C-alpha cells in the first residue's frame, strides 16, 4: 500500500565534553537503512539494510557530506538558540529534526514533512501546504523570517515532490523482498492467575511487520478500552515487532472476553479467546 521515507537528526550539546554529538538515521517505513554518528572513529554514512548496499561510492560520499554538513549547521544553531532564549553556555541542549515523504500505492506524493524541536518542544514546522511555516514562539519566528527570506520552503517543496518520492520509489523496488512484504502477527492468549477471584488474560502479537497493529479486548462485545493494559509496540531486534494487551478478568468469566487483532498482514481481523 502506502509507504514513507524519513530522516531523523539529533544534536546534543555537552559543554566541557567536546562538540555536540550528532546522530542521524534514515528509514523506509519501519526499516532502518542508513545511519551516521559523529562519535564513530571515522564517521561516515553507513548502510543498515541489504538493499541500500548496492548504491555506489558517489552515493555514500554525498550522503556522508550531507550528514557532516548537518552536524555543523546544528552546532551553529545550538549557539544561536542560546541567544534567542537568553540561555547560558553551561547546560546541555537538544535540536531534533525530521523530514520526509509519504507516497500512495501508485507512488504519488501524499504528504511531505519537515519539522524541528528544541529541547524536546516544537520549534518550527513546514505546513502541509509545503509553502508556509508554523513557529511555536517568538524565537522560532526569527527563524521563520530568515527562512522566508531565503526561500527555504520553495527548495524544500521541490525536494519533497521530487527526489524524496523518486528515491523512495527506487528503494521500494530494490528492497521489494522485504519492504513490500508484510509479516502477520503470530497470536496467542495466555492466562495468569492473580488470586482466587481473578486472572490476567494476555493477548499476544509476535513477529509482525510493519509495526502498525491494533489489539483490543472486548467483554460481551464492548471494548474494554479503560481496563486494558496495552504495552507499547516494541522491536524484537530482527526487523519484526511485538505487542500485547491484557485484561484482569473474574475467574469463570473468561469466555465473555474476546481479543481482536487488526494488521495489514491479515486478510481479515482476528478474533481470539483463551482456549485452555
Amino acid at each position: 500500500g502506502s509507504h514513507s521515507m524519513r530522516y531523523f537528526h539529533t544534536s546534543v550539546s555537552r559543554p566541557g565534553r567536546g562538540e555536540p554529538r550528532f546522530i542521524t538515521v534514515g528509514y523506509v517505513d519501519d526499516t532502518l537503512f542508513v545511519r551516521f554518528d559523529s562519535d564513530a572513529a571515522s564517521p561516515r554514512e553507513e548502510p543498515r539494510a541489504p538493499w541500500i548496499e548496492q548504491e555506489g561510492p558517489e552515493y555514500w560520499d554525498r550522503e556522508t557530506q550531507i550528514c557532516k554538513a548537518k552536524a555543523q549547521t546544528d552546532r551553529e544553531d545550538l549557539r544561536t538558540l542560546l541567544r534567542y532564549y537568553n540561555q547560558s553556555e553551561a547546560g546541555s541542549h537538544t535540536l531534533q529534526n525530521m523530514y520526509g515523504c509519504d507516497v500512495g500505492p501508485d507512488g504519488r506524493l501524499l504528504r511531505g514533512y519537515h519539522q524541528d524541536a528544541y529541547d524536546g518542544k516544537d520549534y518550527i514546522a513546514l505546513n502541509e501546504d509545503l509553502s508556509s511555516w508554523t513557529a511555536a514562539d517568538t524565537a522560532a519566528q526569527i527563524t521563520q523570517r530568515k527562512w522566508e527570506a531565503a526561500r527555504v520552503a520553495e527548495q524544500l517543496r521541490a525536494y519533497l515532490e521530487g527526489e524524496c518520492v523518486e528515491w523512495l520509489r527506487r528503494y521500494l523496488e530494490n528492497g521489494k523482498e522485504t519492504l513490500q512484504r508484510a509479516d502477520p502477527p503470530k497470536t496467542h492468549v495466555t492466562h495468569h492467575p492473580i488470586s482466587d477471584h481473578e486472572a490476567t488474560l494476555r493477548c499476544w502479537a509476535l513477529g509482525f511487520y510493519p509495526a502498525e497493529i491494533t489489539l483490543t479486548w472486548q467483554r460481551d462485545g464492548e471494548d474494554q478500552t479503560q481496563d486494558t493494559e496495552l504495552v507499547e509496540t516494541r522491536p524484537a531486534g530482527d526487523r519484526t515487532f511485538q505487542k500485547w494487551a491484557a485484561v484482569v478478568v473474574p475467574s469463570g468469566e473468561e469466555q465473555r472476553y474476546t481479543c481482536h487483532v487488526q494488521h495489514e498482514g491479515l486478510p481479515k481481523p482476528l478474533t481470539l479467546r483463551w482456549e485452555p
Binding site: 550531507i66 550528514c67 549547521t73 544553531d77 520549534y123 527555504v152
Partner: peptide, 10 residues
C-alpha cells in the same frame, strides 16, 4: 536520498 541545501541556519 537526503535533502541537500546550503548554509541553512536557524
Amino acid at each position: 536520498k537526503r535533502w541537500i541545501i546550503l548554509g541553512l541556519n536557524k
